[PDB]
């Protein structure tokens, strides 16, 4: 009879969490930002077009310098681009062409790529030989890698379709922490600015906040109706936004432990593939399956703009660390810089 | 204009573009096959014949044509999150074991393995990413099926079966029950073969079906189809 008592205590704990969330929900974000001025109409133009990829681009990640970016495509190539001059700085051929995620290290010395091979390949960009070579192959996950972010040159957090996330030491090649609890394929992750916490979104329609040092799940956030494909923190690290297949984006607050806003429109039925915030966090940019990117007002839930330059699904998206530009990658094999 | 180091960086980018173009041409000259089919359907034997965790890639060359075969059977995750990676494959090879007509799933009680194979074939054939992709259907274990059919009847799997309890009629009925699951009959063809286990017959069938797919795609590109 233990199982029934455990599951009733679990449903009582869930009712207590829901009642505490209802208790602290004294107002809404829409009622407080009702008297601030609207952003207006954001019209961004394509400053640059990055051609060279010959298959679908699945992931792009900006560098901390806000000039160099890495892209990953399923033809079998990682390309580091100089976005000011559209020069290809590096072309790295991959051992497995089924890449789904790419990352740029904060220092700029390494890049990583993960995919259906279930391995995270760490490439060293600053060698004495003048070529890029494999520095590490992090093996251990039993599912495809969906997102990888560097914390520093020696530590990387990865998310997988095995329903778990992991923290790795790149020197030894061994998982240092394992984050378990998700019952669905983890599709994305996002590091906090301080890098002490990360959120992960999975296919069980929930997001989880994780403590890097302690290895525990601090908070769980629900509200979506389908697979959470994308997640990203607000710039101060006290909130984050999720994008899902239910054609809505949601803003969640860590301290209030609740959903603050829903960004949706009746004319949108396609799922969100990517989300990022601007430099001040006032604009929320989301990529969709309608071949377009929508710019929303992160405080008023109004659509402020549309980035419509692609012929296929906008798979990925990123905003520079100075906030000067937005890069969008798509399945039509082209990367576009917007401003 | 540009400085000297800027000009040399542009020249390096041009050489990178040239090497990317050459690798893209060499990749476009290859035939991509996605190997699917439920567990213990004969896929391993097929791979062994053709060749002489995560995704496994087999490279072979038959008649100056290079084939890359991608097996994704080890991926135990949600299939709809990575199946769109294989949207532009040249063909799909689906393996079905005939001997499993009267067997049942170990994982799920009272679930016929043929009904699970029909469900998987119906899921990927009418999938939104494989609308134009042709399917090569291999019905494996014909010999085992022939031996089994004399003892055990086909009516365990299909209760609406009314024909003879021999090899040819039951095999044609099973082939009909897989080929009628194709809803988009106009866009895609299903090439059915009964694996012989002999020397090069299977790869020859694959070669012929891929040649037919390349013809149909050239016809579509040339506007004639």
């Amino acid at each position, epitope marked *: 009879s233990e199982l029934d008592q455990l599951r009733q205590e679990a449903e009582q704990l869930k009712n207590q969490i829901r009642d505490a969330r209802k208790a602290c929900a004294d107002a809404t974000l829409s009622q407080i930002t009702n008297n601030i001025d609207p952003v207006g109409r954001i019209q961004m133009r394509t400053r640059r077009t990055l051609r060279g990829h010959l298959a679908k681009i699945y992931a792009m990640h900006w560098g901390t310098d806000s*000039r*160099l970016l890495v892209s990953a495509s399923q033809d079998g190539k990682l390309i580091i681009w*100089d976005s000011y*001059t559209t*020069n290809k*700085v*590096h072309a790295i051929p991959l051992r497995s062409s089924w890449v789904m995620t790419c990352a740029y290290a904060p220092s*700029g010395n390494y890049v990583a790529c993960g995919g259906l091979d279930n391995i995270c390949s760490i490439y060293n960009l*600053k060698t*004495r*030989e*003048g*070529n890029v070579r494999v520095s590490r192959e992090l093996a251990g996950h039993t599912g495809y890698l969906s997102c990888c972010r560097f914390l520093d040159d020696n530590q990387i957090v990865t998310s997988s379709g095995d329903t778990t996330c992991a923290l790795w030491d790149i020197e030894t090649g061994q998982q240092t922490t394992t984050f378990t609890g998700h019952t669905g394929d983890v599709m994305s992750l996002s590091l906090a600015p301080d890098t002490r916490l990360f959120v992960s979104g999975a296919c069980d329609a929930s997001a989880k906040l994780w403590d890097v040092r302690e290895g525990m799940c601090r908070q769980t956030f629900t509200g979506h109706e389908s697979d959470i494909n994308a997640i990203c923190f607000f710039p101060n690290g006290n909130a984050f936004a999720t994008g899902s297949d239910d054609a809505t984006c949601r803003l969640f607050d860590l301290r209030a432990d609740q959903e603050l806003m829903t960004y949706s429109h009746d004319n949108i039925i396609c799922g969100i593939t990517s989300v990022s915030f601007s430099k001040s966090g006032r604009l929320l940019l989301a990529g969709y399956d309608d071949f377009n990117c929508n710019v929303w007002d992160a405080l008023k839930a109004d659509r402020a703009g549309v980035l419509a330059g692609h012929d296929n699904r906008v798979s990925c998206l990123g905003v520079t660390d100075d906030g000067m530009a937005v890069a969008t990658g798509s399945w039509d094999s082209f990367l576009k810089i917007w401003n | 204009t540009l*400085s*000297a*180091e*800027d*000009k*040399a*960086a542009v*020249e*390096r980018s*041009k*050489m990178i573009d040239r090497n990317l173009r050459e690798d893209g041409e060499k990749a476009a000259r290859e035939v991509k096959l996605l190997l699917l089919g439920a567990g213990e359907s004969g896929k391993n034997t097929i791979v062994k014949q053709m060749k002489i965790t995560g995704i496994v890639e087999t490279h072979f060359t038959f008649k100056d044509l290079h084939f890359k075969m991608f097996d994704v059977g080890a991926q135990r995750s949600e299939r709809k999150k990575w199946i769109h990676c294989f949207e532009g494959v040249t063909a799909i090879i689906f393996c079905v074991a005939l001997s499993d007509y009267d067997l049942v799933l170990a994982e799920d009680e009272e679930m016929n393995r043929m009904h699970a194979s029909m469900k998987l074939f119906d899921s990927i054939c009418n999938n939104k990413w494989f609308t134009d992709t042709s399917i090569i259907l291999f019905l494996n274990k014909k010999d085992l099926f022939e031996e089994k059919i004399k003892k055990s009847p086909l009516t365990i799997c299909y209760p609406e079966y009314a024909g003879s309890n021999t090899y040819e009629e039951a095999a044609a009925y099973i082939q009909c029950q897989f080929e009628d699951l194709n809803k988009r009959k106009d866009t895609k063809e299903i090439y059915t073969h009964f694996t012989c286990s002999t020397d090069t017959k299977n790869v020859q069938f694959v070669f012929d079906a891929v040649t037919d797919v390349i013809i149909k795609n050239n016809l579509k590109d040339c506007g004639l189809f």
Partner: single-chain antibody
Amino acid sequence: DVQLVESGGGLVQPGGSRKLSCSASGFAFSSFGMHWVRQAPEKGLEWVAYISSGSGTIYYADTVKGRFTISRDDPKNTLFLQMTSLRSEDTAMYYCVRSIYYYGSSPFDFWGQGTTLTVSSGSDIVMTQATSSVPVTPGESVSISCRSSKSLLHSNGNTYLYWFLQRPGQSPQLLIYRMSNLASGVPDRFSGSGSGTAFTLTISRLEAEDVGVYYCMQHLEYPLTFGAGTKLELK
């Protein structure tokens, strides 16, 4: 391990011909542009020739133009310099130098050991190192200065000046690239500054391994020109 080895030197008669070779090992040779730099037996460094990665771009100094021919064999990892109609002024030690060019790269970062050639008997940028010898004592901080006839600050934000150190009996070593960036494997005591036309290299806490000749070089436009060199000696 990166190695550039030069062969083919020796005594030649005027009007003759010789072919110098440079064997490369330990790096991806075909992705690097290669240079030939000469050093007269008592003078400073002079740039001779340059071939790009992929052999698409070839430059020559005016003194050697029409006589010298630079080439490369990328499957054999060899750089060649075919010199014809030699003159007495071509007696010098010849160095092959590797330089790769991309955003954030450090060109001129490895120099070969050099091969000795003995020949028996207007709008170029001028780099000026006014003092030719500074006596120094270990522990102190020293500043070496270079000036340019043309502003080396480009419109892209880069200032194309490079600092090199040649120890006694060795090949030159890259110290600073693009005015302020410190080269890989160089200690943090070296620092470069300047403003378009006037530049300074500061060595804090001078050690005994810092004596030798210091050369400034511009990489704004071809031909590349060196400074006369400032010598640091003890006492």
